[PDB]
Amino acid sequence: PYYLVKESLKAGISICEQWVIVCNHLTGQVWQRYVPHPWKNEKYFPET
Amino acid sequence: TEFTEQGPREAEDLDCLAAEV
């Protein structure tokens, strides 16, 4: 039953990629605008 | 053109199979 697998599999990929993308983008501005965190224009996530 | 015939039903099966894949 690959039909249902394809649907759920694509979701799994979207979960994996979407989190990494938003982490790498948003971190750059969050630590500059909302919290004066020592790190600026840098990421944290190992991206496993 | 649109004469009836026995067999055209196949179009329904072709569409149902395309949907499920």
PDB file of C-alpha atoms in Angstrom:
ATOM      1  CA  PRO A   1       0.000   0.000   0.000  1.00  0.00           C
ATOM      2  CA  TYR A   2       2.493   2.628  -1.188  1.00  0.00           C
ATOM      3  CA  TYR A   3      -0.317   5.113  -1.878  1.00  0.00           C
ATOM      4  CA  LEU A   4      -0.766   5.920   1.810  1.00  0.00           C
ATOM      5  CA  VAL A   5       2.974   5.556   2.440  1.00  0.00           C
ATOM      6  CA  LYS A   6       3.765   8.275  -0.100  1.00  0.00           C
ATOM      7  CA  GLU A   7       1.405  10.697   1.644  1.00  0.00           C
ATOM      8  CA  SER A   8       2.811  10.062   5.122  1.00  0.00           C
ATOM      9  CA  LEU A   9       6.398   9.859   3.853  1.00  0.00           C
ATOM     10  CA  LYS A  10       6.200  13.282   2.218  1.00  0.00           C
ATOM     11  CA  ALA A  11       4.909  14.658   5.519  1.00  0.00           C
ATOM     12  CA  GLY A  12       7.917  13.172   7.302  1.00  0.00           C
ATOM     13  CA  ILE A  13      10.258  14.963   4.910  1.00  0.00           C
ATOM     14  CA  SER A  14       8.383  18.242   5.268  1.00  0.00           C
ATOM     15  CA  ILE A  15       8.709  17.955   9.060  1.00  0.00           C
ATOM     16  CA  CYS A  16      12.441  17.358   8.822  1.00  0.00           C
ATOM     17  CA  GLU A  17      13.215  20.117   6.313  1.00  0.00           C
ATOM     18  CA  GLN A  18      10.756  22.737   7.558  1.00  0.00           C
ATOM     19  CA  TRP A  19      12.139  22.725  11.104  1.00  0.00           C
ATOM     20  CA  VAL A  20      15.722  23.107   9.867  1.00  0.00           C
ATOM     21  CA  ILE A  21      14.800  25.953   7.510  1.00  0.00           C
ATOM     22  CA  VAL A  22      12.883  28.001  10.077  1.00  0.00           C
ATOM     23  CA  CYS A  23      15.556  27.398  12.718  1.00  0.00           C
ATOM     24  CA  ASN A  24      18.365  28.668  10.471  1.00  0.00           C
ATOM     25  CA  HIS A  25      16.380  31.667   9.267  1.00  0.00           C
ATOM     26  CA  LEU A  26      14.533  32.871  12.366  1.00  0.00           C
ATOM     27  CA  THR A  27      17.446  32.397  14.769  1.00  0.00           C
ATOM     28  CA  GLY A  28      19.310  35.160  12.944  1.00  0.00           C
ATOM     29  CA  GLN A  29      16.691  37.751  13.854  1.00  0.00           C
ATOM     30  CA  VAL A  30      15.243  36.442  17.132  1.00  0.00           C
ATOM     31  CA  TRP A  31      18.557  36.820  18.970  1.00  0.00           C
ATOM     32  CA  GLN A  32      18.843  40.399  17.637  1.00  0.00           C
ATOM     33  CA  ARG A  33      15.278  41.707  18.017  1.00  0.00           C
ATOM     34  CA  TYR A  34      13.505  39.966  20.921  1.00  0.00           C
ATOM     35  CA  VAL A  35      16.191  38.540  23.233  1.00  0.00           C
ATOM     36  CA  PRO A  36      19.671  40.135  23.573  1.00  0.00           C
ATOM     37  CA  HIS A  37      21.355  36.730  23.375  1.00  0.00           C
ATOM     38  CA  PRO A  38      25.163  36.712  23.017  1.00  0.00           C
ATOM     39  CA  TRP A  39      24.895  34.801  19.735  1.00  0.00           C
ATOM     40  CA  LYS A  40      23.969  36.883  16.685  1.00  0.00           C
ATOM     41  CA  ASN A  41      23.692  35.840  13.023  1.00  0.00           C
ATOM     42  CA  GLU A  42      24.513  32.219  13.859  1.00  0.00           C
ATOM     43  CA  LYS A  43      22.628  28.925  14.113  1.00  0.00           C
ATOM     44  CA  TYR A  44      22.507  26.246  16.812  1.00  0.00           C
ATOM     45  CA  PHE A  45      20.831  23.157  15.393  1.00  0.00           C
ATOM     46  CA  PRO A  46      22.974  20.140  14.411  1.00  0.00           C
ATOM     47  CA  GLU A  47      20.531  19.535  11.529  1.00  0.00           C
ATOM     48  CA  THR A  48      20.229  15.777  12.028  1.00  0.00           C
TER      49      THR A  48
ATOM     50  CA  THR B   1     -21.037  10.136 -32.741  1.00  0.00           C
ATOM     51  CA  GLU B   2     -22.089   9.134 -29.233  1.00  0.00           C
ATOM     52  CA  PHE B   3     -23.449   5.703 -29.906  1.00  0.00           C
ATOM     53  CA  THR B   4     -23.907   3.254 -27.067  1.00  0.00           C
ATOM     54  CA  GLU B   5     -21.844   0.095 -26.688  1.00  0.00           C
ATOM     55  CA  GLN B   6     -20.900  -2.679 -24.283  1.00  0.00           C
ATOM     56  CA  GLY B   7     -17.387  -2.161 -22.971  1.00  0.00           C
ATOM     57  CA  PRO B   8     -17.026   1.603 -22.469  1.00  0.00           C
ATOM     58  CA  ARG B   9     -17.391   0.991 -18.726  1.00  0.00           C
ATOM     59  CA  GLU B  10     -13.623   0.448 -18.869  1.00  0.00           C
ATOM     60  CA  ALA B  11     -13.238   4.232 -18.629  1.00  0.00           C
ATOM     61  CA  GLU B  12     -14.586   4.105 -15.073  1.00  0.00           C
ATOM     62  CA  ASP B  13     -12.077   1.471 -14.019  1.00  0.00           C
ATOM     63  CA  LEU B  14      -9.245   3.366 -15.700  1.00  0.00           C
ATOM     64  CA  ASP B  15     -10.117   6.499 -13.760  1.00  0.00           C
ATOM     65  CA  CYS B  16     -10.559   4.681 -10.462  1.00  0.00           C
ATOM     66  CA  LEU B  17      -7.140   3.029 -10.815  1.00  0.00           C
ATOM     67  CA  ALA B  18      -5.441   6.326 -11.730  1.00  0.00           C
ATOM     68  CA  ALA B  19      -6.937   7.926  -8.627  1.00  0.00           C
ATOM     69  CA  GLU B  20      -5.623   5.235  -6.262  1.00  0.00           C
ATOM     70  CA  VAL B  21      -2.007   5.373  -7.467  1.00  0.00           C
TER      71      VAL B  21
END
